Amino acid sequence: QFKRIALLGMPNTGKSTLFNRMTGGAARVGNWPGITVELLSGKILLGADMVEIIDLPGIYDLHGFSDDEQVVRHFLHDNVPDLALVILNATQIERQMSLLLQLKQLNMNIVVLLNMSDEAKQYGITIDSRKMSELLQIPVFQLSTGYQEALQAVTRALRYPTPGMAENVRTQLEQDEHIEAEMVRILKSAVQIP
């Protein structure tokens, strides 16, 4: 019944850690439409409203065929998030940007969190989050700090629903889902296994 915030990012980007910070727990929830796996999930008060956070498996390619990538698409297809809170490791920004841009092409509602930003600056990495936000057309926040500003932006991004956005997102996944369906189909018929 509550609006859904999905945590999305690559593996080991601090997602479970952020989840624990937001919820104060490590609750796992199963019986999600479309997937059999149990995921870290919890509901929080965000201002006056209650919202549901779900930590999605870390993945490298939105359109890839690793098991985690399949699970993420199934979840997103059948449980279109009201917000994708995309977590990027500042220290590895060059290598992590692709997932963000892929998710943006799904036509989801996104807020970007640039994690480990101090560690980045301790190396020689400087990030202009205003410029990044400007070019992306997406809110971008750095976390060292930055957390309360990030939550504020979450509330703003959930304030006005978009009719037809579930159908839009489902449609952008269809091509990957077709490949998967064809795999299952052809393997079931043409390949016999022990």
Next chain:
Amino acid sequence: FKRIALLGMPNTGKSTLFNRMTGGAARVGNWPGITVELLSGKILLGADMVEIIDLPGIYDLHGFSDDEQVVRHFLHDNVPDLALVILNATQIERQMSLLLQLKQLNMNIVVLLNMSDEAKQYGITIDSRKMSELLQIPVFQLSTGYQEALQAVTRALRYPTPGMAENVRTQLEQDEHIEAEMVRILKSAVQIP
């Protein structure tokens, strides 16, 4: 010349096949869209001298490994007359993913299932005629199967494929848009030593 792109995952016997098809005479060469040198050789298939290019093994057509980026860049700027796709039969349950990603580009494809004997001993029974029918792509098993595979390749080079180059490039433009955006944002917003 006509061009065949040899495509498969790593450790599928692609190197040994390319060596055989090119008779040991392959040389290094540069190609538009990539800065790396690739190996290619000549082979006579029916009426045509054909150039076969050995592309780096990849796992995910849309992934961001260096090899994957080179294969996509190569394909975009050098659309092959035939993609010759080599899968490991024992790992057919997963490796089907790359074949279907490549089909989705609207390429002209022949599939070779290598190590088909090993697969049968693992208890994996593949019915390649049925698989060919369902894919609408010719499928041939190797272990020997080489002559038959190469006659299908020759046949797959005969019919017209009008607009294909345009179709393949169009299908790859999603990937190139991601890459273009990545560069744009990284240049303007990020300074790394």
